[PDB]
A paper describes a structure:
PL kinase is one of the key enzymes involved in PLP metabolism. In the presence of MgATP, this enzyme catalyzes the phosphorylation of the three inactive primary forms of vitamin B6, i.e. pyridoxine (PN), pyridoxamine (PM), and pyridoxal (PL) to their 5′-phosphorylated forms, PNP, PMP and PLP, respectively. PL kinase is a homodimer with each active site exclusively formed by a single monomer. The ATP binds in a shallow cavity at the active site, while the vitamin B6 substrate binds in a solvent-inaccessible deeper cavity opposite but facing the γ-phosphate of the ATP.
We also co-crystallized hPL kinase with ginkgotoxin (4′-O-methylpyridoxine) and MgATP, and the ternary complex structure was refined to 2.15 Å resolution. We observed bound MgATP and ginkgotoxin at both subunit active sites. The binding mode of MgATP is conserved as previously described for the wild-type hPL kinase-MgATP complex. The ATP β- and γ-phosphates are further stabilized by bound Mg2+ and Na+, the former ion being associated with both phosphate groups, while the Na+ is only associated with the γ-phosphate. The two molecules of ginkgotoxin are bound to the PL binding sites of the two enzyme monomers. We also observed what appears to be the phosphorylated product of ginkgotoxin bound at the PL sites, overlapping the bound unphosphorylated ginkgotoxin, although the electron density map showed a break in the ring structure and the phosphate moiety. Ginkgotoxin and its phosphorylated analog were refined with occupancies of 60% and 40%, respectively. The displacement of the ginkgotoxin phosphorylated analog toward ATP has placed its phosphate group about 3 Å from the ATP γ-phosphate group, as compared to the ∼6 Å closest distance between the ginkgotoxin C5′-OH and the ATP γ-phosphate. Like the hPL kinase D235A structure, we also observed a second bound Mg2+ at each active site that lies close to the ginkgotoxin phosphate and mediates an interaction with the ATP γ-phosphate, helping to dissipate the negative charges.
Author numbering:
A (entry chain B), B (entry chain A): 3 to 312
Write the structure that this text describes.
Amino acid sequence: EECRVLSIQSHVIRGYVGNRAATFPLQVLGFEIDAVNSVQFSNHTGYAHWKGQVLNSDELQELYEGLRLNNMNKYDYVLTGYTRDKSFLAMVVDIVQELKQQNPRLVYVCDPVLGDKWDGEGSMYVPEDLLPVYKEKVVPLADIITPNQFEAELLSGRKIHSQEEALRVMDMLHSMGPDTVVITSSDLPSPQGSNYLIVLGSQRRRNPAGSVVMERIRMDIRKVDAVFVGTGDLFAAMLLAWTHKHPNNLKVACEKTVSTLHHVLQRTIQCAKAQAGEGVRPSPMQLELRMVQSKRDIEDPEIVVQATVL
Amino acid sequence: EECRVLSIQSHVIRGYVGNRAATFPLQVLGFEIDAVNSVQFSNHTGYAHWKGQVLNSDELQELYEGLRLNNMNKYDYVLTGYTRDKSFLAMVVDIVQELKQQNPRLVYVCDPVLGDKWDGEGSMYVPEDLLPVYKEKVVPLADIITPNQFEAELLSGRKIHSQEEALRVMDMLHSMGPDTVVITSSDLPSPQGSNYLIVLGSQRRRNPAGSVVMERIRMDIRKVDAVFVGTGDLFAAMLLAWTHKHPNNLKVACEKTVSTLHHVLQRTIQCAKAQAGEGVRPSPMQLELRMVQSKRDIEDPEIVVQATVL
Ligand SMILES: Nc1ncnc2c1ncn2[C@@H]1O[C@H](COP(=O)(O)OP(=O)(O)OP(=O)(O)O)[C@@H](O)[C@H]1O
Ligand SMILES: Nc1ncnc2c1ncn2[C@@H]1O[C@H](COP(=O)(O)OP(=O)(O)OP(=O)(O)O)[C@@H](O)[C@H]1O
Ligand SMILES: COCc1c(COP(=O)(O)O)cnc(C)c1O
Ligand SMILES: COCc1c(COP(=O)(O)O)cnc(C)c1O
Ligand SMILES: [Mg+2]
Ligand SMILES: [Mg+2]
Ligand SMILES: [Mg+2]
Ligand SMILES: [Mg+2]
Ligand code: NA
Ligand code: NA
């Protein structure tokens, strides 16, 4: 009785992004998550300053060699996110692969971090020579991917202007490999305002009888006037967690994931406003996620937003 | 309204030692703990194999500069443990000195890892050139130290054959600087039977009126027939937590600390035996701390041991 996860992400001393946004939450939910830190920086790169070291593909390979020699290369899930190096990303592919040989039932949850959009136009935040690797090597191996609108577009090659185009892109993404695709954020039109960001879910699965079916969901989340870092990593981590508990219920899984984010952010923005005054926009430091103060919400998130069925 | 802790210890991918044994429990208890991973290995050195890389003193300084450049050099506590390099430890002393300059109220919890004793004879397991650094620079800075019997011996130059010699050696360490000294394990005889190890605590403090008072405690812990790794790091992390919540009550802080280790170990030995099989001695892998499954015990440990005031 234990679920083992190998998470290969960034590590920071101060703050919560990468393995720091993902680890504590999964530990609180009872997963045996082993963290491989692809980097060690003082804090995330949205700060005015930051210093640190990165891990190269050789060292990553070296670290994996250790686990293998000890016959500890048996996981239930693998989790990856922001990766800045192509050789590193390739080594990750070689690793997930072997781990999948060892355990065919392994679920590779992949957050294909490539970039995002701002105001209107989007741009990459990672080496462009990563996109082909993700397309031909990483995604075909993935079981669950969580790209944002911009990443869904780059991966599929199609731009998204409406919900129906999103769904079509999702199907394209399903054909590339993963049975679960969740667009974690988008500027799609919303009947509630425009102050809302849209989340779209799509999961294909074989039912008991053996019929292959697909469940689709949509969520309209009201925007918080501030920029957060780590929340996508958190999103992917909780999705892993909740699909694990509700494997045939994408609706409930996403509602628990999105609600956990809501409570963490609500608490985070309250503490930030007070920290740096009335009217003052909080600094990156003050906007760090109140992760430990949110233990209870992570354990049993009260559902504050139900998804609409598609 | 945070209590920030800076823990500089080792990191392993699989298992619980160093920062792996200290972070989760401190996070669970509500502390904003930031982890500097002095090393990143696949697993602890108690296994037949282990690969990984170390962090050099330049890199440690580099990371520290990132924190300083951002004004994130304000901690309430600093926690250190096993260090193999003398250069690294020196750099650590310099960092603590400055952090103390930045905050005169900072509490430095030092676990002076040097070695241990297997049935009678002691043995060091880190460079011998570290003892002077510890005696001269490290311990003088520390506010709370927690050596096992052997380290306290080395640190003082005085052999411990009984409780009262242990209390005399602890009084010597207080004079070296630290106001709280806790011997985390010893060969001392117990009126409980041979199957018991002894823990001794000593706290030098000031009372309202303004006079310096001493509190001395003893605990007889039932030995578990197995070698665990990470338990000392956990002891030091939990002693930090509970002394923080119970400032002038070494007795309680120790009862909660030792009780926590008790529940964690009872759960560990049980799962280990269930895997190894009746009669069979569990392997290191099977004895890895059941940290995540012990969350509730960490939050509020049921006191299964009462400390006797000396
Ligand atoms: N400003 C915000 N207001 C409200 N919710 C937000 C905000 N920022 C992030 N979130 C929450 O975090 C989730 C992830 O969004 P984010 O924009 O953080 O990740 P992404 O950009 O979607 O993922 P990634 O960059 O890792 O591929 C959103 O779906 C939402 O639930
Ligand atoms: N075999 C065991 N049986 C019972 N308790 C144990 C056992 N091993 C460790 N412990 C628990 O761990 C605590 C610390 O002992 P350990 O021997 O683990 O650390 P130390 O050697 O005292 O510290 P360090 O090695 O970090 O300087 C003990 O006080 C006890 O609570
Ligand atoms: C600008 O990148 C910040 C960042 C994030 C942000 O994730 P998100 O909160 O935008 O989802 C994750 N990992 C690392 C290492 C990061 O540096
Ligand atoms: C023999 O030391 C094992 C070990 C510990 C043990 O702590 P303890 O369980 O003996 O208290 C801590 N950190 C590293 C890197 C270690 O390798
Ligand atoms: Mg975004
Ligand atoms: Mg990310
Ligand atoms: Mg010991
Ligand atoms: Mg130790
Ligand atoms: Na995403
Ligand atoms: Na000790």
